[PDB]
Amino acid sequence: GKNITVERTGEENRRLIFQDCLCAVCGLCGEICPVSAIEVNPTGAMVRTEQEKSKIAIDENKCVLCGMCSSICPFQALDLQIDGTSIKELAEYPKIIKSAEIDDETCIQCKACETACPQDAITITRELPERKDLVTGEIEIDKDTCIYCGMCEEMCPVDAIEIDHQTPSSASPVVATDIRVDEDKCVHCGICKRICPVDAIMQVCPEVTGTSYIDPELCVNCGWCQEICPVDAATVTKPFEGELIIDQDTCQACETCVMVCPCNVLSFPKPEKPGEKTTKLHKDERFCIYCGACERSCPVTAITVKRNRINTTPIRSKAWKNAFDSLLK
Amino acid sequence: MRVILNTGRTIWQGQAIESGKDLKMYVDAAAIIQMNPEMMKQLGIAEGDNVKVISEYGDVVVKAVEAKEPLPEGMVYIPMGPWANRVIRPYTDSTATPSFKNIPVEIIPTDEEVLDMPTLMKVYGKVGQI
Amino acid sequence: AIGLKAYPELCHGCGNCVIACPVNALRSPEVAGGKGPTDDVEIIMIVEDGVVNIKNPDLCGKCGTCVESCPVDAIRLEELE
Amino acid sequence: SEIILTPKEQPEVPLEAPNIKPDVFAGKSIEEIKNIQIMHGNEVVKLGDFFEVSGEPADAPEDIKIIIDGDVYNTKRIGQEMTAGEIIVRGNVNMYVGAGMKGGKITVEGNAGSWAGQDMRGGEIEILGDAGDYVGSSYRGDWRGMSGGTITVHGNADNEIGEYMNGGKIIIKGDVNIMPGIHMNNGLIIIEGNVVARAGGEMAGGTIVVKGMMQEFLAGFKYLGVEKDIEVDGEELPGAFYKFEGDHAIKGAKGIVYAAVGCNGHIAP
Numbered sequence: 001g002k003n004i005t006v007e008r009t010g011e012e013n014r015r016l017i018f019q020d021c022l023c024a025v026c027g028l029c030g031e032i033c034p035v036s037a038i039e040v041n042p043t044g045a046m047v048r049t050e051q052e053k054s055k056i057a058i059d060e061n062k063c064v065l066c067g068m069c070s071s072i073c074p075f076q077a078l079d080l081q082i083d084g085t086s087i088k089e090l091a092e093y094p095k096i097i098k099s100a101e102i103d104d105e106t107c108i109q110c111k112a113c114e115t116a117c118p119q120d121a122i123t124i125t126r127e128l129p130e131r132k133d134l135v136t137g138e139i140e141i142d143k144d145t146c147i148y149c150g151m152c153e154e155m156c157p158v159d160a161i162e163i164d165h166q167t168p169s170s171a172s173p174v175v176a177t178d179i180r181v182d183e184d185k186c187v188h189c190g191i192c193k194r195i196c197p198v199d200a201i202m203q204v205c206p207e208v209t210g211t212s213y214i215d216p217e218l219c220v221n222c223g224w225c226q227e228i229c230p231v232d233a234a235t236v237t238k239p240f241e242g243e244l245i246i247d248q249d250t251c252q253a254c255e256t257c258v259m260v261c262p263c264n265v266l267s268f269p270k271p272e273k274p275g276e277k278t279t280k281l282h283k284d285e286r287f288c289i290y291c292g293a294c295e296r297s298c299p300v301t302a303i304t305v306k307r308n309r310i311n312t313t314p315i316r317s318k319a320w321k322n323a324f325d326s327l328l329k
Numbered sequence: 330m331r332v333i334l335n336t337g338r339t340i341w342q343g344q345a346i347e348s349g350k351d352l353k354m355y356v357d358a359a360a361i362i363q364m365n366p367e368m369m370k371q372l373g374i375a376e377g378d379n380v381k382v383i384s385e386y387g388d389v390v391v392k393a394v395e396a397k398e399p400l401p402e403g404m405v406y407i408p409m410g411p412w413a414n415r416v417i418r419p420y421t422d423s424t425a426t427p428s429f430k431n432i433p434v435e436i437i438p439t440d441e442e443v444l445d446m447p448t449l450m451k452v453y454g455k456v457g458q459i
Numbered sequence: 460a461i462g463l464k465a466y467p468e469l470c471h472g473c474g475n476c477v478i479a480c481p482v483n484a485l486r487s488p489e490v491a492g493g494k495g496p497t498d499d500v501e502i503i504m505i506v507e508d509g510v511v512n513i514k515n516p517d518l519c520g521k522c523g524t525c526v527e528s529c530p531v532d533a534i535r536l537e538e539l540e
Numbered sequence: 541s542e543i544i545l546t547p548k549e550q551p552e553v554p555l556e557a558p559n560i561k562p563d564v565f566a567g568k569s570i571e572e573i574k575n576i577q578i579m580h581g582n583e584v585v586k587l588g589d590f591f592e593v594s595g596e597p598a599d600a601p602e603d604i605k606i607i608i609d610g611d612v613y614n615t616k617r618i619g620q621e622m623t624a625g626e627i628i629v630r631g632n633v634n635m636y637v638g639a640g641m642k643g644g645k646i647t648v649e650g651n652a653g654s655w656a657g658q659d660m661r662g663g664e665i666e667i668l669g670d671a672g673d674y675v676g677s678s679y680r681g682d683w684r685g686m687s688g689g690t691i692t693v694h695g696n697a698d699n700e701i702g703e704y705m706n707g708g709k710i711i712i713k714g715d716v717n718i719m720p721g722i723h724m725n726n727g728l729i730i731i732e733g734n735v736v737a738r739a740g741g742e743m744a745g746g747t748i749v750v751k752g753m754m755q756e757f758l759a760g761f762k763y764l765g766v767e768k769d770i771e772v773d774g775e776e777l778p779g780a781f782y783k784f785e786g787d788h789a790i791k792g793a794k795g796i797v798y799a800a801v802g803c804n805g806h807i808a809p
């Protein structure tokens with residue numbers, strides 16, 4: 001429905017695929033295209049309202065399947081394939097240097113990065129030890145001494161004690177037929193032995209494994225995982241270097257940029273006490289990738305993005321070098 | 330209304346098949362849709378009103394009756410017979426046995442009449458073969 | 460292309476869109492603070508004769524703030540051609 | 541050497557043609573191939589009564605390529621128990637395509653009926669359209685099913701794919717309905733699309749991989765955690781998968797079900 005495929009068959013097959021669900025509407029593909037084949041719809045409208053249209057439109061009569069748009073996209077939304085292989089696996093094509101990884105030996109499966117990730121790209125699992133391995137003790141009920149008062153069963157905090165209650169009959173003239181302690185549930189608190197009115201109860205007092213996974217298609221290299229991690233197990237490198245500039249007086253706090261930002265850089269801080277004033281639009285550039293979506297979305301141009309470097313090895317092709325340099329400002 | 334159609338026996342449908350499938354008592358026992366009173370209230374119908382049942386496989390008109398054997402919420406019951414077999418799932422899943430029970434159907438009130446046994450069978454358009 | 464479109468026949472003239480719009484708020488301190496403009500000003504839209512009326516469509520950035528502010532869908536962002 | 545079978549109008553009473561295979565065509569002239577017997581209901585007929593025949597004969601089945609140049613939607617058992625060579629069907633097939641085959645390759649360009657590759661021992665079956673129920677299954681009553689070979693369906697398949705599977709591999713590129721891998725003992729089933737319900741029901745061993753969504757699953761499975769960038773019998777599957785062991789309704793069950801994390805959060809406990 002909303003995805004677009006531009007394809008051309010022949011001696012060499014070339015196929016450009018656009019995935020609408022991955023697009024952040026940053027506008028970089030439209031800016032880089034040397035033949036202006038792409039038209040990107042308004043950023044705020046595509047994010048904040050219901051639209052039947054795709055986020056971008058690719059003109060088949062202008063596109064030459066060069067792959068510059070696929071290379072620059074920071075969101076993995078555009079992929080150019082040549083004879084079935086993606087340009088990210090072909091060294092002839094300039095590639096942006098970026099990464100995100102978790103060191104499995106250092107990670108303690110705390111799940112803070114999973115919660116913090118703005119793109120839900122992380123999966124953190126953990127196998128907790130069984131409860132019985134985190135307590136030590138012995139417990140035994142003398143069933144001959146037990147009068148089935150039910151006080152231990154009621155007071156047990158984990159429901160480890162079970163009594164087989166019954167209504168007496170002339171054939172079975174008893175209020176219960178058995179009492180048992182589930183030793184896998186018992187936490188050896190000692191409550192049951194202390195409440196028993198006939199002293200029928202005697203009671204006396206594994207590392208965390210897991211998996212860590214970063215989805216490379218959803219990850220945008222924001223660095224939230226690296227910063228939030230308490231043991232420094234996560235490492236991230238970004239595609240671009242730059243600066244954000246906000247004019248607090250021009251901003252009218254419409255919240256468009258806050259909603260648009262795919263890296264959760266921007267926020268509206270709440271005052272801690274009555275009468276306190278806060279910064280109208282708060283940024284933390286440690287999480288910024290300099291995509292430009294915020295600036296593009298702002299109707300009053302109160303927020304601007306400067307891009308100082310695009311991290312690659314030296315670009316050999318003059319056409320590609322000129323296109324990448326046009327995105328610096 | 331979207332509902333789940335269950336089908337099967339009633340003692341009354343049993344008495345009717347053994348008395349005669351050509352009698353009025355067979356139409357009264359098997360050309361019916363049993364429903365909980367709450368569903369009849371949702372649809373705006375009373376016992377004796379007709380209902381048009383439409384599935385992906387066919388359509389039929391049957392008479393609404395209050396269920397004496399309570400149904401789970403959202404389920405209806407048509408007794409086994411040619412009225413039920415206009416709308417249940419024919420496919421056998423390579424077992425030989427059709428899906429006679431628990432089929433999604435659309436039910437609405439109708440002023441159309443229930444078809445008697447010979448009239449219902451005319452929908453198939455039998456052509457003489459000798 | 461996507462642009463601002465009014466449906467005055469559905470409009471209550473409530474003014475939520477006029478006030479919510481960051482372009483209007485930047486151009487008019489009265490609008491920023493919830494009032495209709497009294498000082499002469501050039502803004503995107505105003506409530507006139509009881510309904511929303513688009514005056515300067517070229518100033519719209521198609522952000523969608525006005526759209527979220529209207530519960531009766533009387534101001535929209537849609538394909539104009 | 542190519543032998544071309546051009547179908548005449550297919551009959552309403554289906555044909556059963558287990559003799560359409562390189563093993564029977566080997567060493568026969570074009571005129572002898574036209575006299576090959578097939579069933580048309582309760583009558584024995586000649587292959588030539590329902591197909592035009594042309595091409596070049598060959599003495600060994602490994603050098604024979606049978607091309608059915610048309611739709612054979614009402615022809616059953618094509619390629620049954622073949623050991624070598626190739627069959628290409630430029631259209632649909634009915635039930636039992638490649639049933640019990642030991643080697644060679646069958647390509648169906650259209651759809652296939654139920655029991656495609658039933659009791660397969662070796663070779664390859666490739667269906668470019670959809671398949672029916674019982675892809676790579678066993679026969680009624682038998683506890684020993686498919687023991688080898690690869691079956692690939694590019695479209696969708698229905699119920700009980702790999703029923704009582706005891707080796708080999710089944711790949712469904714589309715969706716399946718219910719009970720894939722029912723009573724599976726060994727082998728590998730990969731479903732690239734979705735499953736409605738009961739994957740691995742009563743399985744004792746083998747592996748099932750679901751890349752799409754399982755709408756419903758089974759309480760007899762134990763959740764083992766997540767595994768990433770898995771490899772099963774040489775097949776590399778990138779990404780994260782919820783891992784389950786079962787079906788523990790069966791004594792000594794060691795079967796594994798992998799389900800893609802992205803669309804199966806509701807299946808994990």
Ligand code: SF4
Nearest residue numbers: 023024026027029073
């Ligand atoms: S570059 Fe930005 S706008 Fe273009 S496809 Fe990627 S995310 Fe969408």
Ligand code: SF4
Nearest residue numbers: 033063064066067069
């Ligand atoms: S492949 Fe090249 S020509 Fe086509 S849209 Fe992308 S940048 Fe423009």
Ligand code: SF4
Nearest residue numbers: 146147149150152196
């Ligand atoms: S408290 Fe003592 S007497 Fe009462 S039920 Fe428990 S064990 Fe038996």
Ligand code: SF4
Nearest residue numbers: 156186187189190192
């Ligand atoms: S020790 Fe505490 S947990 Fe164990 S049975 Fe007695 S009351 Fe329950």
Ligand code: SF4
Nearest residue numbers: 117219220222223225
């Ligand atoms: S870099 Fe950002 S997007 Fe990538 S996994 Fe870490 S938190 Fe998620």
Ligand code: SF4
Nearest residue numbers: 107108110111113229
């Ligand atoms: S925040 Fe650090 S320790 Fe905690 S789960 Fe993520 S990588 Fe592992």
Ligand code: SF4
Nearest residue numbers: 251252254255257298
């Ligand atoms: S910077 Fe622009 S987009 Fe962001 S809240 Fe302020 S006015 Fe709205």
Ligand code: SF4
Nearest residue numbers: 261288289291292294
């Ligand atoms: S704040 Fe940074 S990451 Fe967020 S939208 Fe703006 S440029 Fe992109």
Ligand code: SF4
Nearest residue numbers: 470471473474476529
């Ligand atoms: S368009 Fe909607 S928000 Fe704006 S004045 Fe009319 S009813 Fe109020």
Ligand code: SF4
Nearest residue numbers: 480519520522523525
């Ligand atoms: S879309 Fe944004 S800029 Fe345009 S009128 Fe609505 S609120 Fe103002």
Ligand SMILES: [Ca+2]
Nearest residue numbers: 678679681682
């Ligand atoms: Ca069997």
Ligand SMILES: [K+]
Nearest residue numbers: 114115116117
């Ligand atoms: K998250």
Ligand SMILES: [K+]
Nearest residue numbers: 153154155156
């Ligand atoms: K208790």
Ligand SMILES: [K+]
Nearest residue numbers: 226227228229
């Ligand atoms: K840190």
Ligand SMILES: [K+]
Nearest residue numbers: 295296297298
């Ligand atoms: K802007």
Ligand SMILES: [K+]
Nearest residue numbers: 526527529532
């Ligand atoms: K609205």
